[PDB]
Amino acid sequence: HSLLTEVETYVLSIVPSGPLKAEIAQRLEDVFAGKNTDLEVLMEWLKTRPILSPLTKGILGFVFTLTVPQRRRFVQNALNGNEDPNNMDKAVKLYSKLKSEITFHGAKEIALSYSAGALASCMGLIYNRMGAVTTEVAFGLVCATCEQIADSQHRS
Amino acid sequence: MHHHHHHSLLTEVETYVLSIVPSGPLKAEIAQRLEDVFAGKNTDLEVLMEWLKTRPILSPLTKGILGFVFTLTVPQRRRFVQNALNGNEDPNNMDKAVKLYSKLKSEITFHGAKEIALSYSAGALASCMGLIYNRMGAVTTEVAFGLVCATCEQIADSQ
């Protein structure tokens, strides 16, 4: 699907360049192509990768948890970060909005108004309330969060 | 550190919880469960939680509070508890719930914590519990108790 391939592109955009990036991709694709499952061994593999910042692991964990038909703590930790107020004050308002969105694009457009921090905080909390938004909308958020992070790594 | 709570505090907490449960034999059962779990009668959470989930009479909200408490004192996280506490997710209950959530991370006394929590509505508090429920390590156990009691007081007051 164009959508899944688009998401994966956004997701992949934050992983550092290397062989892992191509491995992480293959996984994302098998998961997308409807192949196997056992998110367990997947999250296990995912939580033991050397080079991936914790935030990258959280987002990947979120994505896999979202695409693979259980609330691992390393996913919750990395996403919530320092639970810095405001980040949490925004993610809550972003969250209340996303509950009303239905399209991947309506969702990504709004989520891109918020900072990387509040976004990760918004993902981290929807990770506990996964049925609060649709999969597409959730995707919109993920993508928006990867562009905000990619742009943060840019301002160097 | 250590996980010893004074039997006075536990009975304090126990009377607040019990304040929202309707009289009847069920309430007497809950008291038993709550007390011998306060004493630490080698209790199993999954059992308790399952029992708690399948109980009649009890409103969802009361099941969430009791569920929060048991998890708090006994050594997976349920769902009926999250829905119960979270419930409605009013975009304001959550606003306040997050602000309270951050203040309690710097609190250390059941009293100090229960003192602040009361400055909030039964709704925000319930959402705050819902938050800590997925982050029981954010605040200490006694502080968590303060929130529970302040929450039980607020609803027993709206009643």
Author numbering:
A (entry chain B): 1 to 69, 75 to 161
B (entry chain A): -5 to 69, 75 to 158
Give the original sentences from the paper that presented this experimental model:
As the most abundant viral protein encoded by the M gene segment, matrix protein 1 (M1) forms a shell underneath a host cell-derived lipid biolayer to connect the vRNPs with the viral envelope in mature virions. The full-length M1 protein includes 252 amino acids consisting of a highly organized N-terminal domain and a flexible but less ordered C-terminal domain that are linked by a protease-sensitive loop. So far, only the N-terminal domain of M1 has been structurally resolved at an atomic level, showing that at neutral pH the physiological monomers have a high tendency to oligomerize via a so-called ‘face-to-back’ arrangement, whereas at acidic pH the N-terminal domain exists as a dimeric structure in a so-called ‘face-to-face’ arrangement.
However, the G88E mutation causes M1 to be trapped in a face-to-face orientation regardless of pH that consequently resulted in inefficient virus growth and genetic instability. Surprisingly, M(NLS-88E)-neutral dimerizes in a face-to-face manner at neutral pH in contrast to a face-to-back monomer–monomer arrangement as possessed by wt-M11EA3 (pH 7.0) and M(NLS-88R)-neutral. A further look at M(NLS-88E)-neutral structure reveals that the G88E mutation results in three inter-subunit salt-bridge/hydrogen-bond interactions including Lys104-NZ to Glu88-OE1 (and its symmetry-related counterpart) and Arg134-NE to Glu88-OE2 that may explain why M(NLS-88E)-neutral that is predicted to crystallize as monomers in a face-to-back arrangement is actually driven to dimerize in a face-to-face manner at neutral pH. Interactions between the monomers that form the face-to-face dimer in M(NLS-88R)-acidic, M(NLS-88E)-acidic or M(NLS-88E)-neutral involve hydrophobic contacts (mainly between the symmetry-related helices H6, and between helices H9 and loops L9), as well as several hydrogen-bond and/or salt-bridge interactions. However, M(NLS-88E) M1 is trapped in a face-to-face-oriented conformation irrespective of environmental pH. In the case of M(NLS-88E)-neutral with misshapen face-to-face monomer–monomer interactions that seem unfavorable for M1 oligomerization, a thin, uneven and broken M1 layer still forms beneath the M(NLS-88E) viral envelope as exhibited in our TEM images. This could be due to the presence of the C terminus that may provide sufficient stabilization for a malformed M1 layer.
